[PDB]
C-alpha cells in the first residue's frame, strides 16, 4: 500500500486539460471532475480506487502489463 501510495496521483479536471485517456478500464466508467486518478510509470491512468485494488494483488499495468513498481 505504501509503494502504491507513492505512485503519482491527481484529481481529474476535464476543463483544464484534455487527456487522451478519458476512462478507467477497470470499472469501465469515465473519468469525472475531482476524482482521484493514479498514474503508473508507463503513463497509463486509472481511478486510484480501482487500480489500487488491482495493484494490491498484481504488479502490472492492466493496459500494457508494465511493472508498476518500476
Amino acid at each position: 500500500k505504501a509503494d502504491i501510495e507513492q505512485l503519482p496521483s491527481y484529481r481529474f479536471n476535464p476543463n483544464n486539460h484534455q487527456s487522451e485517456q478519458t476512462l478507467c478500464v477497470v470499472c469501465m466508467c469515465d473519468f469525472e471532475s475531482r476524482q482521484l486518478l493514479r498514474v503508473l510509470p508507463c503513463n497509463h491512468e486509472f481511478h486510484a480506487k480501482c487500480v489500487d485494488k488491482w495493484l494490491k494483488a498484481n504488479r502490472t499495468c492492466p493496459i500494457c502489463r508494465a511493472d508498476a513498481s518500476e
Binding site: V25, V26, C27, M28, W54, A57, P62, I63
Partner: protein, 146 residues
C-alpha cells in the same frame, strides 16, 4: 462486480464484434451464455460454438470462468470444454472485456499451443500429421458445430 458486468453488456450492444455474442442467460448477471463463429478458412469454418461464462464475485479483479458447451477438437481445450489459456488465469487483466475475451478465444482456435497442451494426443497429431489434424477438426465441426 455487478455494475461492471452491466457495463460489459452495454459495450456489447453498442459496439458488437463480428464473430461473437454474449449475455446473461436469465436474470442472473453472473451467469452468461456466449457464441463464437468458427473463423473462415480453418477447420472450424462454418461452425457455431456455444460457451458458458461465470463471473466471479470479485470480477474484474479475477478472470471470468469460460468454457465451451459445444464439443471442439483442439490441443488447448478438452472434452469438458475447459479452456487452458493464460489470460483466463495468471495473465488476466481487467482491461479485457468479455468481448475481448471471446475474441481472444476465437483467435486461439487457429493459433494453438501444441507444446504445452491440455490434450496431449491432439497436440501430437497437430505436430506430426497436420492434414490429419485438420481433417478431424473439420469432422468435429461438421458433427457438433453445424
Amino acid at each position: 462486480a455487478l455494475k461492471r458486468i452491466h457495463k460489459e453488456l452495454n459495450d456489447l450492444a453498442r459496439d458488437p464484434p463480428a464473430q461473437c455474442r454474449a449475455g446473461p442467460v436469465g436474470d442472473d448477471m453472473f451467469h452468461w451464455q456466449a457464441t463464437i463463429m468458427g473463423p473462415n478458412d480453418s477447420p472450424y469454418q462454418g461452425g457455431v460454438f456455444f460457451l458458458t461464462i461465470h463471473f466471479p464475485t470479485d470480477y474484474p479483479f479475477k478472470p471470468p470462468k469460460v468454457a465451451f458447451t459445444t464439443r471442439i477438437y483442439h490441443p488447448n481445450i478438452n472434452s469438458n470444454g475447459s479452456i487452458k489459456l493464460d489470460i483466463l488465469r495468471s495473465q488476466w487483466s481487467p482491461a479485457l472485456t468479455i468481448s475481448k475475451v471471446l475474441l481472444s478465444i476465437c483467435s486461439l482456435l487457429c493459433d494453438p499451443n501444441p507444446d504445452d497442451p491440455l490434450v496431449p494426443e491432439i497436440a501430437r497429431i497437430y505436430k506430426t500429421d497436420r492434414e490429419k489434424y485438420n481433417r478431424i477438426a473439420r469432422e468435429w465441426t461438421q458433427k457438433y458445430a453445424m
